[PDB]
């Protein structure tokens, strides 16, 4: 039982997209968000840099933290970003909320899941 109304709503949106549109990553991310918070992702920039690529949205089924350097001009989609992470990302690319990525890409295409 999640307690955050925003997380609950987000999870429901993710589902709605996964079902309606042909997206399968949203329903996948939704299943991780339903799982215990401790299992959620906590990824620092150093990893997003090592495995991401341009024109491929990096999807973090958790939260992004500001440790390390990010140079690639990538679009990062997460549940939340540490104030530093968001700052460091918008410097070389773009940080986006999962709620936006669901609207901009309900088909969940050209996306890389990172944790």
């Amino acid at each position: 039982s999640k307690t955050n109304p925003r997380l609950s709503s987000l999870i429901a949106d993710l589902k709605s997209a996964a079902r309606s549109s042909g997206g399968a990553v949203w329903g996948d991310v939704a299943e991780r968000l339903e799982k215990p918070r401790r299992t959620h992702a906590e990824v620092n920039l150093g990893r997003i840099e090592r495995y991401a690529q341009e024109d491929e949205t990096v999807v973090v089924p958790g939260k992004v933290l500001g440790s390390g350097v990010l140079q690639k001009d990538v679009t990062v989609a997460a549940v939340d970003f540490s104030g530093t992470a968001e700052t460091k990302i918008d410097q070389v690319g773009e940080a986006v909320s999962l709620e936006q990525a669901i609207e901009n890409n309900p088909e969940g295409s050209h996306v890389r899941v990172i944790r």
Binding site: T3, N4, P5, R6
Partner: protein, 246 residues
């Protein structure tokens, strides 16, 4: 966004930018947690006498007389929990920590969130408040702080179509239960919160169910009584501005 300032007659008088905080996502769960903490932290430590029931040399006769091994004195059972006049087994204790902690960041976020819930006419009506207005919170000029007679503040509220909320709170409830015997006989609905900047409205305070606070220290409770978001509030031109950096 934009907030419409009102003069002491109930007529518009320009407008200012509704500060960003009122755009904070309403997070009732966090607001509820802050109110719970606030209410628990003012609760007083209590507990029965450490020695209640133990002031006796009572002893058990043991086997031999067809009686249960219960300590007795003058043929009267004592001390043990199952005995009348005996000690309370696991009673309330003074040593118990009845307080609750809350991270400053978490608490501040709830203040901002409750503050934001103020600018939502739908939430406000849902919370139970009675008014015939459309825009909210009700922004008023700094000259409100100069009012003296409560009756004056009434006419202003009647002008602002917000006085109905006070008719709502003008009904005390005589509670069910023994709280009555401890001075908690009555209870009443929460009405309008009046936030000013220099000092709390001495004029509005006595209004049925009203609360008066100051922008620098207004909290989660007055903003959301009982952890319920969306209280029909009225800010002061300066209060609004000051409340922004909270």
């Amino acid at each position: 966004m934009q907030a419409t300032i009102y003069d002491l007659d109930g007529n518009t008088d320009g407008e200012v930018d509704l500060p960003d905080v009122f755009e904070t996502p309403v997070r009732s769960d966090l607001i509820g947690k802050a109110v719970r903490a606030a209410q628990a932290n003012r609760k007083q430590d209590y507990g029965s006498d450490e020695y209640a029931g133990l002031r006796t040399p009572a002893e058990s006769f043991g086997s031999g007389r067809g009686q249960a091994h219960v300590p007795k004195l003058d043929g009267r059972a004592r001390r043990v929990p199952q005995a009348v006049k005996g000690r309370s087994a696991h009673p309330p204790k003074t040593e118990k920590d009845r307080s609750l902690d809350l991270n400053d960041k978490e608490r501040q976020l709830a203040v901002r969130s409750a503050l934001a819930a103020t600018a939502d006419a739908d939430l406000v009506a849902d919370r139970g408040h009675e008014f015939d207005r459309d825009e909210v919170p009700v922004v008023v000029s700094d000259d409100f702080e100069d009012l003296v007679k409560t009756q004056e503040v009434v006419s202003l509220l009647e002008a602002l179509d917000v006085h109905a909320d006070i008719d709502r709170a003008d009904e005390t409830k005589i509670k069910a239960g023994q709280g009555s015997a401890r001075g908690r006989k009555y209870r009443r609905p929460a009405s309008i919160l009046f936030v000013t900047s220099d000092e709390p409205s001495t004029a509005a305070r006595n209004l049925a169910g009203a609360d008066v606070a100051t922008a620098s220290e207004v909290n989660t409770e007055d903003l959301a009584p009982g952890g319920a978001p969306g209280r029909l509030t009225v800010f002061t031109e300066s209060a609004l501005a000051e409340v922004a950096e909270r």
